[PDB]
């Protein structure tokens, strides 16, 4: 399924602009969007392995990929978790399923968000990446209201060859990222 908007958006729009705002030499130097990850701090899905699959399967739809599992390792004595049996929910998508996800992001999810104001332009890893936070997971399209037994939250990320948050900012902006200015 190699065909979408955000695809050629980076190609015939962002790419050239990245040659403008900064300018380069080699094609393999211009910041390429390549890695996107998700995560869900599931200390909640400890007691309930049932509620665990629910979050995973829900995720499966909104991501268009295959959910994964990543428990803890240390030992939160304060909050009931130890060995690392409980759970954490992770899922990394790339190539096409990546582009298809971001499309839904800035055209579906972000749009109908509780008093949406944009993306905080500070959430850069000091280098050339970005990390955002979300609550209600139902802001995604396919997620029906009468199906969510909990407004489980989650946070994602996106890696790019970008080395500076200025290049990153420009990139993301050109990609179509409404940054709360």
């Amino acid at each position: 399924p190699l065909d979408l908007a955000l695809k050629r958006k980076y190609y015939e729009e962002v790419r050239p602009e990245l040659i403008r705002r900064f300018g380069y030499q080699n094609v393999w130097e211009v910041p390429r969007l390549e890695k996107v990850v998700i995560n869900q701090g599931l200390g909640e899905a400890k007691e309930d392995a049932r509620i665990l699959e629910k979050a995973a399967q829900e995720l499966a739809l909104i991501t268009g990929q295959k959910p994964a599992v990543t428990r803890a390792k240390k030992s939160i004595s304060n909050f009931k978790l130890r060995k690392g049996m409980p759970i954490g929910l992770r899922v990394t998508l790339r190539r096409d399923r990546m582009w298809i996800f971001l499309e839904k992001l800035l055209n579906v999810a972000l749009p109908r968000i509780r008093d949406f104001r944009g993306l905080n332009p500070n959430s850069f890893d000091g280098r050339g990446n970005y990390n955002l936070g979300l609550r209600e997971q139902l802001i995604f399209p396919e997620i029906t209201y009468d199906m969510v037994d909990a407004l489980r939250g989650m946070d994602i990320a996106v890696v790019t060859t970008a080395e500076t948050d200025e290049e990153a900012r420009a990139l993301l902006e050109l990609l179509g990222f409404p940054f709360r200015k």
């Binding site: 399924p1 979408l4 096409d96 298809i100 055209n107 579906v108 749009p111 109908r112 399209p141």
Partner: peptide
């Protein structure tokens, strides 16, 4: 399959998701 976002404000994108009949609203068109 081509997810036809039928958002209620005048935008129908052909993304890729489950059930092309994805009824939404308040997207990027409004």
């Amino acid at each position: 399959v081509p997810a036809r976002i039928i958002c209620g404000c005048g935008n129908v994108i052909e993304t890729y998701s489950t059930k092309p009949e994805i009824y939404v609203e308040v997207c990027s068109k409004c």
